RNA sequence: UUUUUUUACUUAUUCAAUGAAGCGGGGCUGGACUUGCGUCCAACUUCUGGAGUUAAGGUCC
């Protein structure tokens, strides 16, 4: 059963999202880490499509994004469903070394050796995990290829270890906008 | 701080001082980290590599022979 | 059916007025004997 | 004496079908003029089998199968509710109420005769050994036949010792002193 | 392909056949005496005729109105020990610098609770809304309270959970709570809740509160009476 | 507070509500043991005027005697 | 059999045609629904008529939803009698 | 019992009381340390520092393995960071005392042999790659082993630093650590 | 509104039995009558002084 208050709340959420998206559309290179968090249950088609291209379907999925004008517009569009910021070298290194998976043959392959990187990105001069880290962190010419090779990171929920807060989501919605260097606390807690 | 090495049973029982069971066939205590031989090197000598290759090859031959024998019996 | 429509209306009214937590689990007991439970000593 | 002479407790098997038992021993019960029969039934709820003690009807023998229940046949030794027998049938150990495991017609050579049935109110009219007429619920049980050991009282006891042997295990007051042989302080007949 | 040596051995659970399986026998469990007593107490209260002053406590707020009432009332929970200690520290500092405690402490707006306190508030008409728990034992403590609120013109509602009211007032249980005054940013919400209570509980229970309760038959007695009425109608 | 109302209501022992409560409580106390501990007084105003306090160290025991 | 018309008033901002249909389809099948709106601006006037196919289904929905406190509004849910139903109500 | 009290506070809606009682739980996800203190157990299980130095092979292999693992519920991320910190402190002691003797590059990892107070200590470190947590191991019992070994290595590090007259724990620079200093984020200076 | 009579009921009270095991009401199947489908009545073991207990199996993972 669905409540009438749920229906009214969903309409007001959609009207607020429509007003915000219309304002963004009327208004019209760094590295950011973006984590999908829980937000509004009903998502408009344009934020849904932006999550499609950003590979942020499941909760606690993390991706690396090069900051351009188009990507900044996409991030501003999907701000109510993401937590994003500037990752440091320790965060990038730990993410790639501990939760690093590549997409070869459409399959998820853990980065257990430099040979996978050599046969998947060796045409771009990337022959090792450290070359991949260098491309991601310095945002090189082949950042798109490196980030597309990297599978979205599956980050863990720290609340699962404690029984009284077992169902609680780690990142609560509401703190919109860039977290800047404070995304590294979330990455350190969840990685 | 705390710097160690410097009615409740304040002494441990000798059953605790008894050594643990070893699963090795000779009954002796296996080291926690065994000493690696030359055949396990990433760039090993030719003699050690050939010795390891010969041992694993004859083991594989024996295993496949036994497997085919049991398949024929079945 | 008319009875099915009436039952659906009753179910919707009950869910609106009292909620959706209508059911409860009870222990299956294969014996008629109740033992005092063992607690911490 | 080891056990009282009672029917099985009125359970589901006797209420709806029949359960078979086997007569193992026919034994002498001290203080009772009638023999007892040890009958073993199965437990319908566990692997162990149950030993019962019945008053033995005449014609019962060791190794004989007997049947207790609503759907049991009309044979000597079988235990049936009174609604399951026709008029004119004599029975032993007839329950006064369904479930008290036998009250009427228990001594040697005695029985209870089913005079009639009132099926509307579920009652049965029976004739007792004293000649009395009684009405019992039709679900009351009884064992088909006459209690064994009949004709016991025909033989004269002939001896004070035989009377003493009879009453020593029966606990009855023996010898009996007449009240007229007593003093006026001992008996109202005294003097 | 399956092994030909595997065999099906069905069991027959008819009378005189194989041993019965282990079924759920919870309906016939020999319960402990305290469980049996509390269940039979509930059943006896269902069986007897309940006078209307007790029977009116079977009508409570529904889920939506109870949730709205608690949504308002959770903004007005009383002071905790830590909050009171901090307030007393601020007042002590103000006294030390030579200012009154009312200079640094504002007027509080809390949920009024405690049975004698709330009864006095109702008698002096200071209470604007009264919520009475439906499960007070002994019931004589709150049996007169609907009549008192009706005589003094106070809106009241019977609500489920003295433990639920205890969560409001930082106790294990609370027999009754009352709202006298709220803040100006919640005056409209308080007026709307009072009007919702008046229109959706009191008018709906205006006639049922005067009726006798209980008098319900058991399952087997109900089936026996239905069979008897069917037999009488057929014959 | 409410204890004045409780005293006035306890005066009316032949009223319908008090008779119903007496009947159900008589059945319950007959089901319980001859002497048993009560968690709280069943007549709080009567206990309070006889000297009971809701303080650690005051207990209530219920007892039935053959009349 | 006979359809039943429910008149609902004091609607809050957000309880419009889609939400009303989705909510009351849980109670029963809805054949017609309309929200009283002004033609000048298109805004709702906090009133609606929902005619279900089934009369006591409509009665049950009205009795359930009457005096429901929803977003600071106390809903009004009455049953329009078949004698007083406008033949051009659901145009 | 404390977890029951926290559940009661959360169920009643006392968020401040729940947080205050949760501060007494000493959760590893918050502290980086084991939930239960094993300091008294360490002395009982190693009567002598020589016994501890003889168990250092298993201790160092386990901790150097777990410093490269992802965060789980058994071993949280702050625990893994503390394991890495202890391994770095031990490596700094080995550097300043020149106790490292042999190193080997095998097909399974890097073997290190050091000599501390006349005892030969050999431990195996994985290559820096993604490590596979397979289902054939009992990972939670491995986590309990990790808690014990991290408790042991803390005391061993303190004893060695005090023996060579250095303050313990060494100064740690979080800014350089977040920039990626690893071993370089430690500053070693003498005692008093 | 009350007094008498009988005439039902169950919840007080009383009795009995059991290891508190199959009660009450429906469903399925079969048989009878009935109206042209409602009742009631039945499911299950009877040549033999054997044996019967740790679920076989089916189907989704």
PDB file of N, CA and C in Angstrom, chain A residues 13-96:
ATOM      1  N   UNK A  13       8.583  16.835  -4.587  1.00  0.00           N
ATOM      2  CA  UNK A  13       9.968  16.552  -4.949  1.00  0.00           C
ATOM      3  C   UNK A  13      10.196  16.698  -6.449  1.00  0.00           C
ATOM      4  N   UNK A  14       9.274  16.177  -7.266  1.00  0.00           N
ATOM      5  CA  UNK A  14       9.436  16.299  -8.713  1.00  0.00           C
ATOM      6  C   UNK A  14       9.291  17.738  -9.186  1.00  0.00           C
ATOM      7  N   UNK A  15       8.416  18.526  -8.557  1.00  0.00           N
ATOM      8  CA  UNK A  15       8.282  19.923  -8.965  1.00  0.00           C
ATOM      9  C   UNK A  15       9.513  20.734  -8.558  1.00  0.00           C
ATOM     10  N   UNK A  16      10.112  20.420  -7.401  1.00  0.00           N
ATOM     11  CA  UNK A  16      11.352  21.082  -7.010  1.00  0.00           C
ATOM     12  C   UNK A  16      12.496  20.703  -7.941  1.00  0.00           C
ATOM     13  N   UNK A  17      12.581  19.422  -8.311  1.00  0.00           N
ATOM     14  CA  UNK A  17      13.624  18.977  -9.231  1.00  0.00           C
ATOM     15  C   UNK A  17      13.443  19.586 -10.616  1.00  0.00           C
ATOM     16  N   UNK A  18      12.195  19.702 -11.079  1.00  0.00           N
ATOM     17  CA  UNK A  18      11.930  20.326 -12.371  1.00  0.00           C
ATOM     18  C   UNK A  18      12.316  21.799 -12.363  1.00  0.00           C
ATOM     19  N   UNK A  19      12.008  22.508 -11.272  1.00  0.00           N
ATOM     20  CA  UNK A  19      12.376  23.919 -11.165  1.00  0.00           C
ATOM     21  C   UNK A  19      13.896  24.074 -11.153  1.00  0.00           C
ATOM     22  N   UNK A  20      14.588  23.211 -10.398  1.00  0.00           N
ATOM     23  CA  UNK A  20      16.047  23.281 -10.319  1.00  0.00           C
ATOM     24  C   UNK A  20      16.706  22.964 -11.660  1.00  0.00           C
ATOM     25  N   UNK A  21      16.215  21.936 -12.360  1.00  0.00           N
ATOM     26  CA  UNK A  21      16.778  21.583 -13.660  1.00  0.00           C
ATOM     27  C   UNK A  21      16.502  22.660 -14.701  1.00  0.00           C
ATOM     28  N   UNK A  22      15.312  23.270 -14.657  1.00  0.00           N
ATOM     29  CA  UNK A  22      15.006  24.368 -15.570  1.00  0.00           C
ATOM     30  C   UNK A  22      15.900  25.569 -15.302  1.00  0.00           C
ATOM     31  N   UNK A  23      16.167  25.859 -14.024  1.00  0.00           N
ATOM     32  CA  UNK A  23      17.078  26.946 -13.674  1.00  0.00           C
ATOM     33  C   UNK A  23      18.494  26.671 -14.169  1.00  0.00           C
ATOM     34  N   UNK A  24      18.964  25.428 -14.014  1.00  0.00           N
ATOM     35  CA  UNK A  24      20.305  25.062 -14.474  1.00  0.00           C
ATOM     36  C   UNK A  24      20.403  25.175 -15.992  1.00  0.00           C
ATOM     37  N   UNK A  25      19.387  24.680 -16.706  1.00  0.00           N
ATOM     38  CA  UNK A  25      19.387  24.754 -18.165  1.00  0.00           C
ATOM     39  C   UNK A  25      19.266  26.189 -18.667  1.00  0.00           C
ATOM     40  N   UNK A  26      18.542  27.046 -17.943  1.00  0.00           N
ATOM     41  CA  UNK A  26      18.455  28.450 -18.331  1.00  0.00           C
ATOM     42  C   UNK A  26      19.774  29.171 -18.083  1.00  0.00           C
ATOM     43  N   UNK A  27      20.447  28.852 -16.973  1.00  0.00           N
ATOM     44  CA  UNK A  27      21.727  29.484 -16.671  1.00  0.00           C
ATOM     45  C   UNK A  27      22.823  29.033 -17.631  1.00  0.00           C
ATOM     46  N   UNK A  28      22.774  27.773 -18.071  1.00  0.00           N
ATOM     47  CA  UNK A  28      23.762  27.166 -18.977  1.00  0.00           C
ATOM     48  C   UNK A  28      25.190  27.264 -18.445  1.00  0.00           C
ATOM     49  N   UNK A  29      41.588  21.892 -15.888  1.00  0.00           N
ATOM     50  CA  UNK A  29      40.972  20.575 -15.798  1.00  0.00           C
ATOM     51  C   UNK A  29      41.438  19.840 -14.547  1.00  0.00           C
ATOM     52  N   UNK A  30      40.553  19.735 -13.562  1.00  0.00           N
ATOM     53  CA  UNK A  30      40.848  19.043 -12.320  1.00  0.00           C
ATOM     54  C   UNK A  30      40.307  17.618 -12.371  1.00  0.00           C
ATOM     55  N   UNK A  31      40.532  16.884 -11.286  1.00  0.00           N
ATOM     56  CA  UNK A  31      40.049  15.521 -11.126  1.00  0.00           C
ATOM     57  C   UNK A  31      39.090  15.477  -9.948  1.00  0.00           C
ATOM     58  N   UNK A  32      37.923  14.871 -10.147  1.00  0.00           N
ATOM     59  CA  UNK A  32      36.967  14.703  -9.062  1.00  0.00           C
ATOM     60  C   UNK A  32      36.627  13.229  -8.922  1.00  0.00           C
ATOM     61  N   UNK A  33      36.383  12.822  -7.684  1.00  0.00           N
ATOM     62  CA  UNK A  33      35.842  11.509  -7.379  1.00  0.00           C
ATOM     63  C   UNK A  33      34.379  11.669  -6.999  1.00  0.00           C
ATOM     64  N   UNK A  34      33.525  10.848  -7.606  1.00  0.00           N
ATOM     65  CA  UNK A  34      32.077  10.936  -7.458  1.00  0.00           C
ATOM     66  C   UNK A  34      31.563   9.604  -6.929  1.00  0.00           C
ATOM     67  N   UNK A  35      30.771   9.656  -5.858  1.00  0.00           N
ATOM     68  CA  UNK A  35      30.185   8.479  -5.228  1.00  0.00           C
ATOM     69  C   UNK A  35      28.670   8.603  -5.298  1.00  0.00           C
ATOM     70  N   UNK A  36      28.013   7.561  -5.795  1.00  0.00           N
ATOM     71  CA  UNK A  36      26.557   7.544  -5.826  1.00  0.00           C
ATOM     72  C   UNK A  36      26.004   7.292  -4.428  1.00  0.00           C
ATOM     73  N   UNK A  37      25.107   8.169  -3.975  1.00  0.00           N
ATOM     74  CA  UNK A  37      24.482   8.052  -2.667  1.00  0.00           C
ATOM     75  C   UNK A  37      22.971   7.995  -2.856  1.00  0.00           C
ATOM     76  N   UNK A  38      22.274   7.659  -1.775  1.00  0.00           N
ATOM     77  CA  UNK A  38      20.822   7.546  -1.811  1.00  0.00           C
ATOM     78  C   UNK A  38      20.183   8.929  -1.791  1.00  0.00           C
ATOM     79  N   UNK A  39      19.235   9.152  -2.697  1.00  0.00           N
ATOM     80  CA  UNK A  39      18.533  10.418  -2.763  1.00  0.00           C
ATOM     81  C   UNK A  39      17.043  10.252  -2.984  1.00  0.00           C
ATOM     82  N   UNK A  40      16.490  11.008  -3.934  1.00  0.00           N
ATOM     83  CA  UNK A  40      15.077  10.886  -4.263  1.00  0.00           C
ATOM     84  C   UNK A  40      14.850   9.587  -5.025  1.00  0.00           C
ATOM     85  N   UNK A  41      13.796   8.855  -4.645  1.00  0.00           N
ATOM     86  CA  UNK A  41      13.525   7.551  -5.248  1.00  0.00           C
ATOM     87  C   UNK A  41      13.190   7.673  -6.730  1.00  0.00           C
ATOM     88  N   UNK A  42      12.392   8.668  -7.098  1.00  0.00           N
ATOM     89  CA  UNK A  42      12.052   8.904  -8.496  1.00  0.00           C
ATOM     90  C   UNK A  42      13.031   9.918  -9.074  1.00  0.00           C
ATOM     91  N   UNK A  43      13.709   9.536 -10.144  1.00  0.00           N
ATOM     92  CA  UNK A  43      14.755  10.346 -10.763  1.00  0.00           C
ATOM     93  C   UNK A  43      14.257  10.797 -12.130  1.00  0.00           C
ATOM     94  N   UNK A  44      14.396  12.074 -12.479  1.00  0.00           N
ATOM     95  CA  UNK A  44      13.988  12.543 -13.811  1.00  0.00           C
ATOM     96  C   UNK A  44      14.847  11.928 -14.901  1.00  0.00           C
ATOM     97  N   UNK A  45      14.335  11.866 -16.141  1.00  0.00           N
ATOM     98  CA  UNK A  45      15.069  11.163 -17.213  1.00  0.00           C
ATOM     99  C   UNK A  45      16.441  11.735 -17.533  1.00  0.00           C
ATOM    100  N   UNK A  46      16.625  13.058 -17.455  1.00  0.00           N
ATOM    101  CA  UNK A  46      17.949  13.613 -17.737  1.00  0.00           C
ATOM    102  C   UNK A  46      18.975  13.265 -16.657  1.00  0.00           C
ATOM    103  N   UNK A  47      18.696  13.400 -15.346  1.00  0.00           N
ATOM    104  CA  UNK A  47      19.641  12.837 -14.364  1.00  0.00           C
ATOM    105  C   UNK A  47      19.816  11.331 -14.467  1.00  0.00           C
ATOM    106  N   UNK A  48      18.770  10.588 -14.846  1.00  0.00           N
ATOM    107  CA  UNK A  48      18.926   9.147 -15.041  1.00  0.00           C
ATOM    108  C   UNK A  48      19.895   8.843 -16.178  1.00  0.00           C
ATOM    109  N   UNK A  49      19.808   9.598 -17.275  1.00  0.00           N
ATOM    110  CA  UNK A  49      20.736   9.418 -18.387  1.00  0.00           C
ATOM    111  C   UNK A  49      22.152   9.827 -18.003  1.00  0.00           C
ATOM    112  N   UNK A  50      22.293  10.881 -17.200  1.00  0.00           N
ATOM    113  CA  UNK A  50      23.631  11.287 -16.780  1.00  0.00           C
ATOM    114  C   UNK A  50      24.248  10.234 -15.862  1.00  0.00           C
ATOM    115  N   UNK A  51      23.436   9.620 -14.996  1.00  0.00           N
ATOM    116  CA  UNK A  51      23.919   8.488 -14.210  1.00  0.00           C
ATOM    117  C   UNK A  51      24.237   7.282 -15.092  1.00  0.00           C
ATOM    118  N   UNK A  52      23.505   7.112 -16.201  1.00  0.00           N
ATOM    119  CA  UNK A  52      23.834   6.074 -17.181  1.00  0.00           C
ATOM    120  C   UNK A  52      25.242   6.264 -17.736  1.00  0.00           C
ATOM    121  N   UNK A  53      25.556   7.472 -18.222  1.00  0.00           N
ATOM    122  CA  UNK A  53      26.906   7.671 -18.759  1.00  0.00           C
ATOM    123  C   UNK A  53      27.980   7.730 -17.678  1.00  0.00           C
ATOM    124  N   UNK A  54      27.640   8.120 -16.454  1.00  0.00           N
ATOM    125  CA  UNK A  54      28.627   8.182 -15.387  1.00  0.00           C
ATOM    126  C   UNK A  54      28.777   6.866 -14.635  1.00  0.00           C
ATOM    127  N   UNK A  55      27.992   5.842 -15.000  1.00  0.00           N
ATOM    128  CA  UNK A  55      28.098   4.485 -14.447  1.00  0.00           C
ATOM    129  C   UNK A  55      27.884   4.476 -12.934  1.00  0.00           C
ATOM    130  N   UNK A  56      26.857   5.189 -12.485  1.00  0.00           N
ATOM    131  CA  UNK A  56      26.566   5.384 -11.072  1.00  0.00           C
ATOM    132  C   UNK A  56      25.192   4.831 -10.720  1.00  0.00           C
ATOM    133  N   UNK A  57      24.906   3.609 -11.176  1.00  0.00           N
ATOM    134  CA  UNK A  57      23.598   3.012 -10.930  1.00  0.00           C
ATOM    135  C   UNK A  57      23.439   2.606  -9.472  1.00  0.00           C
ATOM    136  N   UNK A  58      24.350   1.781  -8.969  1.00  0.00           N
ATOM    137  CA  UNK A  58      24.207   1.254  -7.624  1.00  0.00           C
ATOM    138  C   UNK A  58      24.733   2.255  -6.606  1.00  0.00           C
ATOM    139  N   UNK A  59      24.224   2.142  -5.378  1.00  0.00           N
ATOM    140  CA  UNK A  59      24.741   2.940  -4.277  1.00  0.00           C
ATOM    141  C   UNK A  59      26.179   2.511  -3.990  1.00  0.00           C
ATOM    142  N   UNK A  60      26.982   3.462  -3.496  1.00  0.00           N
ATOM    143  CA  UNK A  60      28.391   3.267  -3.147  1.00  0.00           C
ATOM    144  C   UNK A  60      29.234   2.864  -4.354  1.00  0.00           C
ATOM    145  N   UNK A  61      28.878   3.371  -5.529  1.00  0.00           N
ATOM    146  CA  UNK A  61      29.724   3.264  -6.707  1.00  0.00           C
ATOM    147  C   UNK A  61      30.506   4.554  -6.878  1.00  0.00           C
ATOM    148  N   UNK A  62      31.801   4.421  -7.108  1.00  0.00           N
ATOM    149  CA  UNK A  62      32.687   5.567  -7.244  1.00  0.00           C
ATOM    150  C   UNK A  62      33.363   5.592  -8.599  1.00  0.00           C
ATOM    151  N   UNK A  63      33.486   6.794  -9.167  1.00  0.00           N
ATOM    152  CA  UNK A  63      34.143   6.994 -10.453  1.00  0.00           C
ATOM    153  C   UNK A  63      35.039   8.225 -10.396  1.00  0.00           C
ATOM    154  N   UNK A  64      36.009   8.254 -11.307  1.00  0.00           N
ATOM    155  CA  UNK A  64      36.870   9.406 -11.533  1.00  0.00           C
ATOM    156  C   UNK A  64      36.355  10.186 -12.735  1.00  0.00           C
ATOM    157  N   UNK A  65      36.314  11.511 -12.608  1.00  0.00           N
ATOM    158  CA  UNK A  65      35.785  12.385 -13.649  1.00  0.00           C
ATOM    159  C   UNK A  65      36.761  13.535 -13.867  1.00  0.00           C
ATOM    160  N   UNK A  66      37.096  13.794 -15.130  1.00  0.00           N
ATOM    161  CA  UNK A  66      37.849  14.985 -15.500  1.00  0.00           C
ATOM    162  C   UNK A  66      36.905  16.178 -15.572  1.00  0.00           C
ATOM    163  N   UNK A  67      37.299  17.288 -14.953  1.00  0.00           N
ATOM    164  CA  UNK A  67      36.417  18.443 -14.811  1.00  0.00           C
ATOM    165  C   UNK A  67      36.518  19.300 -16.068  1.00  0.00           C
ATOM    166  N   UNK A  68      35.491  19.238 -16.907  1.00  0.00           N
ATOM    167  CA  UNK A  68      35.297  20.140 -18.034  1.00  0.00           C
ATOM    168  C   UNK A  68      33.972  20.871 -17.841  1.00  0.00           C
ATOM    169  N   UNK A  69      33.589  21.669 -18.840  1.00  0.00           N
ATOM    170  CA  UNK A  69      32.332  22.409 -18.753  1.00  0.00           C
ATOM    171  C   UNK A  69      31.133  21.469 -18.818  1.00  0.00           C
ATOM    172  N   UNK A  70      31.166  20.512 -19.750  1.00  0.00           N
ATOM    173  CA  UNK A  70      30.075  19.551 -19.882  1.00  0.00           C
ATOM    174  C   UNK A  70      29.958  18.678 -18.641  1.00  0.00           C
ATOM    175  N   UNK A  71      31.092  18.192 -18.128  1.00  0.00           N
ATOM    176  CA  UNK A  71      31.063  17.352 -16.937  1.00  0.00           C
ATOM    177  C   UNK A  71      30.654  18.139 -15.701  1.00  0.00           C
ATOM    178  N   UNK A  72      31.021  19.422 -15.628  1.00  0.00           N
ATOM    179  CA  UNK A  72      30.558  20.268 -14.532  1.00  0.00           C
ATOM    180  C   UNK A  72      29.048  20.452 -14.582  1.00  0.00           C
ATOM    181  N   UNK A  73      28.495  20.628 -15.788  1.00  0.00           N
ATOM    182  CA  UNK A  73      27.044  20.717 -15.936  1.00  0.00           C
ATOM    183  C   UNK A  73      26.360  19.416 -15.529  1.00  0.00           C
ATOM    184  N   UNK A  74      26.936  18.274 -15.919  1.00  0.00           N
ATOM    185  CA  UNK A  74      26.375  16.983 -15.518  1.00  0.00           C
ATOM    186  C   UNK A  74      26.417  16.792 -14.005  1.00  0.00           C
ATOM    187  N   UNK A  75      27.529  17.171 -13.371  1.00  0.00           N
ATOM    188  CA  UNK A  75      27.661  17.040 -11.923  1.00  0.00           C
ATOM    189  C   UNK A  75      26.659  17.939 -11.210  1.00  0.00           C
ATOM    190  N   UNK A  76      26.483  19.172 -11.700  1.00  0.00           N
ATOM    191  CA  UNK A  76      25.476  20.062 -11.131  1.00  0.00           C
ATOM    192  C   UNK A  76      24.065  19.520 -11.323  1.00  0.00           C
ATOM    193  N   UNK A  77      23.825  18.789 -12.415  1.00  0.00           N
ATOM    194  CA  UNK A  77      22.510  18.190 -12.625  1.00  0.00           C
ATOM    195  C   UNK A  77      22.259  17.063 -11.624  1.00  0.00           C
ATOM    196  N   UNK A  78      23.227  16.165 -11.448  1.00  0.00           N
ATOM    197  CA  UNK A  78      23.023  14.990 -10.596  1.00  0.00           C
ATOM    198  C   UNK A  78      23.565  15.208  -9.181  1.00  0.00           C
ATOM    199  N   UNK A  79      23.739  16.462  -8.770  1.00  0.00           N
ATOM    200  CA  UNK A  79      24.142  16.776  -7.398  1.00  0.00           C
ATOM    201  C   UNK A  79      23.282  16.172  -6.280  1.00  0.00           C
ATOM    202  N   UNK A  80      21.939  16.117  -6.345  1.00  0.00           N
ATOM    203  CA  UNK A  80      21.192  15.520  -5.218  1.00  0.00           C
ATOM    204  C   UNK A  80      21.409  14.024  -5.017  1.00  0.00           C
ATOM    205  N   UNK A  81      22.046  13.320  -5.952  1.00  0.00           N
ATOM    206  CA  UNK A  81      22.245  11.882  -5.827  1.00  0.00           C
ATOM    207  C   UNK A  81      23.710  11.487  -5.699  1.00  0.00           C
ATOM    208  N   UNK A  82      24.633  12.449  -5.657  1.00  0.00           N
ATOM    209  CA  UNK A  82      26.054  12.140  -5.623  1.00  0.00           C
ATOM    210  C   UNK A  82      26.726  12.888  -4.479  1.00  0.00           C
ATOM    211  N   UNK A  83      27.897  12.382  -4.098  1.00  0.00           N
ATOM    212  CA  UNK A  83      28.832  13.068  -3.217  1.00  0.00           C
ATOM    213  C   UNK A  83      30.177  13.080  -3.921  1.00  0.00           C
ATOM    214  N   UNK A  84      30.696  14.269  -4.208  1.00  0.00           N
ATOM    215  CA  UNK A  84      31.866  14.380  -5.062  1.00  0.00           C
ATOM    216  C   UNK A  84      32.862  15.351  -4.449  1.00  0.00           C
ATOM    217  N   UNK A  85      34.117  15.188  -4.840  1.00  0.00           N
ATOM    218  CA  UNK A  85      35.152  16.061  -4.323  1.00  0.00           C
ATOM    219  C   UNK A  85      36.472  15.837  -5.021  1.00  0.00           C
ATOM    220  N   UNK A  86      37.529  16.400  -4.432  1.00  0.00           N
ATOM    221  CA  UNK A  86      38.866  16.296  -4.998  1.00  0.00           C
ATOM    222  C   UNK A  86      39.643  15.212  -4.271  1.00  0.00           C
ATOM    223  N   UNK A  87      39.948  14.084  -4.907  1.00  0.00           N
ATOM    224  CA  UNK A  87      40.734  13.046  -4.238  1.00  0.00           C
ATOM    225  C   UNK A  87      42.218  13.372  -4.240  1.00  0.00           C
ATOM    226  N   UNK A  88      42.901  12.917  -3.194  1.00  0.00           N
ATOM    227  CA  UNK A  88      44.338  13.108  -3.122  1.00  0.00           C
ATOM    228  C   UNK A  88      45.069  11.886  -3.677  1.00  0.00           C
ATOM    229  N   UNK A  89      46.403  11.961  -3.652  1.00  0.00           N
ATOM    230  CA  UNK A  89      47.229  10.892  -4.203  1.00  0.00           C
ATOM    231  C   UNK A  89      47.062   9.600  -3.418  1.00  0.00           C
ATOM    232  N   UNK A  90      46.959   9.699  -2.089  1.00  0.00           N
ATOM    233  CA  UNK A  90      46.741   8.511  -1.272  1.00  0.00           C
ATOM    234  C   UNK A  90      45.405   7.854  -1.591  1.00  0.00           C
ATOM    235  N   UNK A  91      44.353   8.658  -1.778  1.00  0.00           N
ATOM    236  CA  UNK A  91      43.044   8.102  -2.105  1.00  0.00           C
ATOM    237  C   UNK A  91      43.050   7.417  -3.464  1.00  0.00           C
ATOM    238  N   UNK A  92      43.660   8.050  -4.472  1.00  0.00           N
ATOM    239  CA  UNK A  92      43.706   7.456  -5.810  1.00  0.00           C
ATOM    240  C   UNK A  92      44.518   6.163  -5.794  1.00  0.00           C
ATOM    241  N   UNK A  93      45.677   6.192  -5.129  1.00  0.00           N
ATOM    242  CA  UNK A  93      46.549   5.024  -5.060  1.00  0.00           C
ATOM    243  C   UNK A  93      45.881   3.868  -4.326  1.00  0.00           C
ATOM    244  N   UNK A  94      45.244   4.155  -3.186  1.00  0.00           N
ATOM    245  CA  UNK A  94      44.595   3.102  -2.413  1.00  0.00           C
ATOM    246  C   UNK A  94      43.376   2.546  -3.136  1.00  0.00           C
ATOM    247  N   UNK A  95      42.623   3.405  -3.833  1.00  0.00           N
ATOM    248  CA  UNK A  95      41.464   2.940  -4.586  1.00  0.00           C
ATOM    249  C   UNK A  95      41.878   2.016  -5.723  1.00  0.00           C
ATOM    250  N   UNK A  96      42.925   2.389  -6.463  1.00  0.00           N
ATOM    251  CA  UNK A  96      43.329   1.570  -7.601  1.00  0.00           C
ATOM    252  C   UNK A  96      44.012   0.286  -7.134  1.00  0.00           C
TER     253      UNK A  96
END
